[model samples]
Target chain A: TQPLVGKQILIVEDEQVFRSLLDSWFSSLGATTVLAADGVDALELLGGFTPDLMICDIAMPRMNGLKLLEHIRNRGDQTPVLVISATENMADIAKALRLGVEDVLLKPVKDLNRLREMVFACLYPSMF
Target chain B: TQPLVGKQILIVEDEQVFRSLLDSWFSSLGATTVLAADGVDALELLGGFTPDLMICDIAMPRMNGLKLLEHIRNRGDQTPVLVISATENMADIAKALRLGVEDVLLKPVKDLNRLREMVFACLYPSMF
Candidate 1:
């Protein structure tokens, strides 16, 4: 069940409860997860931490997922990024897709198995 | 380079040109691909052939991808399925998504790299 063993994930989410849930889930799946509150904190963590994949939230108080994605792309940080948000705005999703993120996923995940499949897909792309 | 040396893929598309292109591309990438004109032929092939992953088109003459998906799921086939079509109908897309498809991609792909990433992701999910 722990196919993500030895994987490192960086989760940037503003909500405390959801963030903690992600951490718990990944930890249980044998992954080391670094949690950040927003884009600014995520960038700060990236100063010293490199993760196999990143899961980010779109709307936040200080900085958002889009800004963080821009920063990562500008700096040539090729870490695969997955954006999870509850936004219904297709415009924002189009922007994220344009930013070269792995995927713009819907939040309040009712299908954890599908989510896990997505994460595994991003983390291990068969080196192609 | 050639990470899919031993991989096998089944591509179900009605379009002749695109189907040939897909076969050529996957062959060049060092993977064996089985091509079918539509879902009917695909089902026939599946009777004896098991691919690592399946890429299917939504619209076809004999049988559409959605019907094929229903059949596959009803029979308890766990093979990963990816759908690609040019349709913009949200209703159809929603159906495909609800059918537990790995992804429903837009056709006439302008970004091959992204498509390649998606295919690789589905084919190799790290056994999670």
Candidate 2:
């Protein structure tokens, strides 16, 4: 009966701990999650998995999240992405928004409830 | 895989037999069903169960269905509501549409596939 059951989610982050945590969180919400270590791995994974939602970190080795976002948009993929970062600078926020990110969340995310709400909003924009 | 499971739906009708049939149908579709015999009973049930979707009959006694519609609208609740009527009269259809009812179904609803599609369209407006 979980609303998110069977939905596919993808997480692209360089940090192993944060990637694992994101995977577990989406799994607990009843979604199947796929994880990538960085933008390069994310692009590789995208060749196989068609995710309904994605969460990506800005800084990564090999390829950055902004580059990955540009690649996705150039390919016309509209799958929603939520960008997470440690910095709360406006430039990063504006860049992500301009690159078509659905939402942005800061590091040490203190509000799990707000995160869930944002994810749900991206999934079901009409509900809000 | 069961998308409809656990969602609450309210059915308001005067005919006990038809109401039971509707309840069974919604149950088979994986939703929790609440039944109300008339408009007065429907209002009482509404106080307890804030249903995500509602199905109501246009004709009933002890406070007709239209009265219930008026009451809900007056309260400024925008929860989706669907109206079903035995007659397919244009006037009735127009009235229901004018009152901002999400959708109207003609009696007998013999086509299960179409009925399910209509119900989904009403519940998830942005999906269609």
Q: Which candidate is the best by lDDT?
A: 1
Grade the docking of candidate 2: incorrect
Pairs in steric clash, model 1: none
lDDT of 1 by residue, B1-69 (tens): 886766777778866567656666675676655555557556755655467888889998768999998
Give the CAPRI rating of model 1: incorrect
Q: By how many angstroms RMSD does model 2 differ from the true structure?
A: 17.4
lDDT of 2 at B112: 77
Compared with the true structure, what per-residue lDDT tens digits does model 1 show for residues A65-105?
Answer: 88888888889888888899999999999988898888988
How many angstroms is residue A9 displaced in model 1 relative to the true structure, after the best TM-score fit? 0.3
lDDT per residue for candidate 2 within A1-128, as digits (tens), equals 35677566777776655765675566667665555454764675465446788888988766888889989888888789999888667887788899889888899888988898888788778832
Q: TM-score for every candidate vs. truth?
A: 0.49, 0.48
Alpha carbon lDDT of residue B42, candidate 1?
65
Return the clash pairs for model 2, or none.
none
DockQ, prediction 1: 0.01
The regions of model 1 sitting more than 4 angstroms off are: B1-128
